[PDB]
């Protein structure tokens, strides 16, 4: 399904188009697209994982 | 131009001030401003690409 | 507060919730929560700076 939605009351903006979202709360944004490709943002940082991530052309590899 | 809109029928979510864009379709989800800068999140990872990119101030240069 | 608007005439989208936001002017696009957590994109490039920044596990540290 689809929903793009702007609520405060609690205090959300959402876009999704099935499994692809964008969300954005008072902790922070997040998006996603299925369940490994994820972009966080909050107050104190940034997370970055998918199942293989290229910059530049550079693949980052991960790290356990 | 300026769109911003949401549609199933086919689903996709579109959010666009001249070249900058974000995107949502079932395949994932784009950020782009103009024709080389690019974030691609998709099932299966991310690519990043920018004529300069920097991370915490350190620049990630070109792989080809 | 929370505000997600779309504006031609003076061009920008914006989506935000208390100290998350993202805009999109035709400069490029902004991605922030709170002061020092920020994703900007612009024609030349990304540039990518939080508290804590983590790619695939592995923490990119800063750079002056």
Request: proline share 2%; hydrophobic share 40%.
């Amino acid at each position: 399904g689809t929903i793009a939605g702007s609520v405060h009351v609690i205090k959300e903006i959402m876009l999704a188009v099935e499994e692809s979202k964008i969300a954005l709360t008072p902790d922070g944004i997040q998006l996603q697209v299925g369940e490994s490709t994820v972009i966080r943002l909050s107050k104190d940082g940034i997370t970055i994982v998918g199942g293989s991530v290229f910059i530049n052309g550079l693949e980052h590899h991960h790290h356990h």
